[PDB]
Every structure is written in structure tokens, then in C-alpha cells.
Amino acid sequence: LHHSEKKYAEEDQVQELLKVLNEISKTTLTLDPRYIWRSLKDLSSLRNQELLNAETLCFTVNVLYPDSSSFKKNLLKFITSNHKSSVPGSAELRNSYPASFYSVNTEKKTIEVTAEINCFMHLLVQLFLWDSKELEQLVEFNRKVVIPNLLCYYNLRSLNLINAKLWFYIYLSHETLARSSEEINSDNQNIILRSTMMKFLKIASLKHDNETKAMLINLILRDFLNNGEVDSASDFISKLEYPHTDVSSSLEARYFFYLSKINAIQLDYSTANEYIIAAIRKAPHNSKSLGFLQQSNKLHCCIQLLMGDIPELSFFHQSNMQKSLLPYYHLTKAVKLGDLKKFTSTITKYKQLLLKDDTYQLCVRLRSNVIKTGIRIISLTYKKISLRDICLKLNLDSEQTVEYMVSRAIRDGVIEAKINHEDGFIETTELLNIYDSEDPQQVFDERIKFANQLHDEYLVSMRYPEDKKTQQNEK
Amino acid sequence: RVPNYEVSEKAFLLTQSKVSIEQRKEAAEFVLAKIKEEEMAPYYKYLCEEYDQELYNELCKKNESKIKELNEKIQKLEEDDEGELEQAQAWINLGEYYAQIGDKDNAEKTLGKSLSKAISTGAKIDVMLTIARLGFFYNDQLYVKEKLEAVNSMIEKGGDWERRNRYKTYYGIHCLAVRNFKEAAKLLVDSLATFTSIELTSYESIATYASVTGLFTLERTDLKSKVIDSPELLSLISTTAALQSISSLTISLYASDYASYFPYLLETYANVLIPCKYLNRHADFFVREMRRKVYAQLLESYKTLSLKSMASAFGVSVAFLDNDLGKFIPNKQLNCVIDRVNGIVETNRPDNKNAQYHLLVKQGDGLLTKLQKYGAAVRLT
Amino acid sequence: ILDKIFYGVLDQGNGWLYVYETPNQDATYDSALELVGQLNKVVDQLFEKASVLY
């Protein structure tokens, strides 16, 4: 019952462990341990559900215990202890073999095999903790051990590849504890959280390990964002060393998400566009990844409306994220028609949903836009329109008010008109035709430069595969 | 043959609450008749939601009779030994018995064998045609599309002109259902001349459809040629209200009469668009298109008009005209600006190289986009 | 004007008929749009066959 299942689980882990142990110890085969470690994490998580998940208990029981032992005992303490074989070293079946670890030499201290195994064991523990929903004590305890555990060691290119996962859980777990409950302690420890991440980053510049840099920078942005500390984020971004070249595409998409958010709020919209479009394409369309996508579309809807664009209706017509994106859709509508009374009703009713995502603050600002789109409309239609008629239609306060809207609107040149005070009407001046202008050149410059970049990427990629198979034996 | 299409036409009426109560209950009688007669009990179940135990007994009986009959018939047709002739025929018949009671599922299995098993190309096309009709029946359009994509491969393989015609007319209906009217028109005009009906609607229906599309898409010169001077339309005159309304609208559009155009607009809505199943869903869309089109038509020939002149001509008040013009101006089709101070309707026309420049860049952004993503994919792989 | 005999515009409010030469649309721009259209279809087909790699 217990025995069989526990045993199989241990075997499975041991198999995995052996593969990566042979791999990591031979030269600079870096990519191989990295791909393998990733797959593994996935396999392990998938594993837990059936044939137990006391693999962790087993897996501790049959390895050298440096501090593993102390953690395991805490974990057992948490879910009410039991003893049945739950102290490590209770089965000696390493037997001073090199693969299961030379038992004596680990004790003598001439060599250290426990180092990399302990990082990997912390990953496995961490994953189980989050999967399980083992909060409070474990979470604190795990964090408390692991931070000084890593600062006890000295990093290598291979150790750097491993902590690129560990730092994600240190962050995430703390957030979960704020997310349980409000504590006075949570306000203090928030500060400590930032502090340890910041230190590790400085060193990691010196290791020139891109993997960890990228991971770290994303975590650090997310914290500033919750406290709405834009001024401090602005200087942070000016550091400029956030790598892209080596990094996985996920880290580029979280990074770009954050960039869109921070730019939009401090009243930059132009550049904020490039970043949100890019962040949608980089994200995959995975079934578990649908939650991310909705969130990205909420934000996009907003960015555009501020800028003065209309997201296609068509794009949202065939989407299935429908129920969540109902608030956003009605905003788009209000802007598109220029309808003044509609707008206000829309933001009062939906206020709470909008507040959660923190799109709300952007939504207040589209109030200037409602009016502007509605003046855009009257101009396209009419070449001379008495200002007196506009004052009734948009139910504007006084003759002075109607002038001032148009006055300010032409400063960004959205409407491009001329007001005649004395003649008491507006006369359209709009060029319309810009083919004649120099402008067509500029538009095409972007088109051509993007295109040329795609040819270069192709060349470089094409030759690499073919070398690998040609070396290999074949007909 | 007749119920296979006709049921859906009536049933649609029933669904709708747009329809007058007189019509709704005129159709109700028609539906009930054909249930009992074709023994539609499985399918009837589907329709009732969307809308005596003797019926049920009629199923249970007819089914077990029809089943036992065909069972041993088919069993014997397979037993005695030659598949080219008997086994192929027997599967056709099996699909047909499923298609009568509208079980979709068991027909896909039987008519699938027939296609797989080697037979004349004629023979293949003919059989597919039934599967497509069940898609049209069910009021699922994408089901029709996959089938008719295959049918199209076989069309020049077989080379029968007979089935090129039949294919055209099915694809014609599929396209009438989707927004896209451009392909519909091309297919539709040829088929006025030629199509012996097969498991699809009467030629009176088909006539009104060619007239409707013709307005929408066609250039002016080409409406006159192909439609008004149609040999077919002229001989067919009007023996139906629907055909009459659409005809009346065509004559004023071409003649640039505008006073009577608007009564006529209203008439076709009542007597054409709502009875027709496929064009019901596009009722709003059509009238929008037509109202832009007429205003447009008149503006093309005049650099200016006064508001009074234009409004008296269409037969609406000046106030009613103003609110309506301004709907369609930011969507760009009428190409006119409007002065309020001098009451004048100016008509700007600045379409030239500028027009065409904008079309090419917009569509261009899209080709770039697709390309980038497929590039990245493969490189990883 | 509707039949493109003389192609001009009648100005009702001056009592004049204005006359234009035949407009000549840019042939290059029209033929270019046909080519672009085609390129999309091409890429769709290719990609369906490239589904084999993944």
C-alpha cells in the first residue's frame, strides 16, 4: 500500500538525479542540464498527483543531509508528525558507490557532492509547497533557510542556472502570505524581500549570467508596481543591462508587460504601444495561458483609447474572453460615438471590476477623449458649423466652454480647424491628402527596416541545424 | 425531396417574432403536416426547443419497419457477393434512410464508406451533395464548407458540366448566408438560366436572390445589362409579392427617381428580407448599404445641392436628412462635407493617388505580421 | 455623368456645368494590390505543410 508506492517514487527521482549528475560534471554542456532541469520540474509536478508525493520524504531519506533533515522535520511538524522511516540515513543503500554518493568522502570533507543536490532538492520542495498550499510556517521557514543557504555557497555557471528558478518561489511565496491575510509583519518583511533580491543581482552582473539577471529584474518591477512607486521605477529602468539575447521568451513578455503598465500611467502613450503589441505576440496561446491573455487585452484596450485610436471591434467580436471584457468593450463604444452621458454611467456601474485590475485610473482619463472624438465627428461631417449648435448638442455650459474644447484639441492637432469668433462658426482646414507631403517616405522607412531584419535572422538560424545532423552518422 | 429544404424555410418563420402573427401561424400548419408525413421524429426534437404520443408511435413503428426492411435487404446485398454494384448502392440507401430522420451521425459513417470504396467520379460528387444539404438543414454553415471544399476538387476531375452547375448553386446559398455577397452574385446570375432543383429551394426563391445581390454589389452599367434586360426576369414577370418589391426598387434606382425610392425601401423589407431565411440576419446591414448607396449616387453627379432640394426629392424632411447623412460620413462612402450657415451641401471628391496609398499600407502591416511569426516558429524547431 | 459620357459635375447653385478630363488611376498601385493579395495565400499554404516540423 504505502510501501510499493513510496518505493517507485524514490526510484523515479533517483533515475532523474543520476542523469543530471553525469551531465553537470562534464565541461560546458550548459544547455543540456538547463533543458533537462526545465522538463524535469514539469514531470515532477505532473507526477505528484498519483502514486503519492512523499517522493520528497524518500528523496531526503536517501541523500546526504546538510540541513535537509531540519526542513523535513519542520514539514512533517506542519501536517502532524508521523514516523515510519522518516530520518535520513535510516536505509544505507548508497554503500560508498560514486553514483549514490560516496558516503565516507562526503563525511571526510575532502570533497563536496551535496552543493548542487541541495539547490535541486530546494526547487523540488518549493514546487511541492506551492502545489500543496502549505502556507504560513513552511513558507517562512523555506525562505529563512534558502537565502543564507545560497549566500553560504559560491556561484558557478551551473549554480547560476539553478537559482534562476529558486528566486521565483522566494518572491511568490511571500506574496501568497500577504494574499492570505494582513499582518503588521507583512509590511516589514516586504522591505526585506526587496533587499535580498537586490544584493544577489549585483553579484550576478559580475557572473555575466543573463538568465538570473532577467528573472530578477522582472520580480523587482512587479513589487514597485504594487506600491505605485513610479518615480523609483523610472530611475531603476535607466540602469540598462536587462539582457535579452540569451533569455527565454517568457522573461521578455513579463518584462514588456510591466513596461507597458509603467509608461501608460506616467502619461506616455506612444512607446507604450510598441511594448503591449510585442508582449501579446511573444505570449503563447496555451490553455493554461489564457488567464494572462485577458489581462493583456484589458490593458491594450486602454492604451489605445488614450492615444486616440479605436481598437477594432472585429478583434473583440470573435474573442471568447467575452464576460470578463464586457467593461472594457463599453468604454470603447463610449469613445467611438463621442456620447457624453453614456460614458459616465459606464464607469460608475463597473467600478469594482475595473479597480481590481487597476485599469480604472486610466479609464477616468478617457473622459477628455470622449469629448474629443465627439468633436472629431462634428468636424468630419460639417465644413461650417455654428458654435451655437455645438453648444446645445454636447450640452456645453456656455459659448466660452465650446470654444475651449476646440482650442485645446487643435493643439495636438487631432481636429485641425480654425475658429472664427466674430463670424460665429468653425471652418474646417484639414489637409486630408498627405500623399503630396514628405510623409509617405517616413511610413515606408519602418516597413523596410523591419523586413531586412527578418532576412538576417533566417540566415543565421538556417546553417546551425544542418551541421548537427551531418556530423552524425547517416547515409 | 421537397421537405428536405422546405421544413427549414417554414421553421425559421416560426422562430422569429419579427413576423406578423398571421404569417407565423400560417407557417405553423405547414410544419406540422410534414412532420408526420416524412417522419422526422429525431430532428423534430431539435426544432421543438427552438419553436401527441401517436407521433412517437409513428416513429417507433416506422423506424422498426424501415430498419428490419433495410437490415436484411442490405445484409443480403452484401452477402451475395459483388461490391461494385450492390454494396455501393446499399450504402447510398443507408445514408438516405438516416438523412430522412435527420440523424446526422450515422449518415457520415455510411456515405463515407461509399466515397472510400472505388466508384465513378460522377458517383462521388452526387453522393457528397447530400451531406452538404444536411449541413444547410441544421443551420450550421461551417459544416457545409468542409464538404464543399472536397466537391470542388472532384469538379474538374469528373468534368461533367451537369455537376458543375449543381455545385455552383449550393455554394451560391452557402455564400448568401455569410456576409460576403461578392462571390454570391457571380454564381447566382448564371444559375437563373440553369439549375434543375435538387434537394434545394424553388426557382422563385432563386430569382429573388439574384435581384437582391444585384443591387448591393453591382456597378450601375452592369445592373442594367444583366438584370433588367435579363431574358429570365422579363418572362417570369411577377407571380409573387417578393419578386414585385424588389423589381419596383430596381426600376427607380436605375431611373434616378427618388421620390418613390423610399416607399419602395420599406416594401422590400417586409416582403423579401424577413421571409427569406438567409437574408434575415443581414436585414439591418442591407438597408444601411442601400441608404448609403442612393445618397451617394445622387452626390456623385452634383458638385453642390441645397438642403431643401435634396430633402424634397427623397421625400423626407430636411431635418430627417441631416441626421442620416452624418451617420455614413465618417465611414467614408458619400464623400461630402456640409455647410450649416449657408445651408449648402458641398461635395468634396479628392480621391486619387491618395486613396490607393492608404489601402496598400494598411493591408501591408498584416503581411509583415504573419511572416514574422511563422519565421520564428520554425527556427526554434 | 452616371454613364461616364463626359464625366463632369453639375453645380446647381451657380447654374453651371463643370467639365473634367478622364481621371487616370495609377496602374502600378492597382496591380500591386493583386500581388500582395496573392502573397498571403502563398504563405498560408506553406505553413500548413510546415505543421510537419512541429
Binding site: P465, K469, T470, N473 | G375 | -
Partner: peptide, 27 residues
Amino acid sequence: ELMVIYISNLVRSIIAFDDLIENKIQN
């Protein structure tokens, strides 16, 4: 071009797996 050369590689890997296996027998 990229895709084309890549089908050719996908074929080459299948060939290469099998050739290796047979070489084990030959040795």
C-alpha cells in the same frame, strides 16, 4: 528556404537514429 532545408533535416535525424542502431550490430 528555411522550412525546406528543415524538412530535409527532420528526415536526416530519423535516418541517423536507425543507422546507429545497425552499426551496433555490425561491431
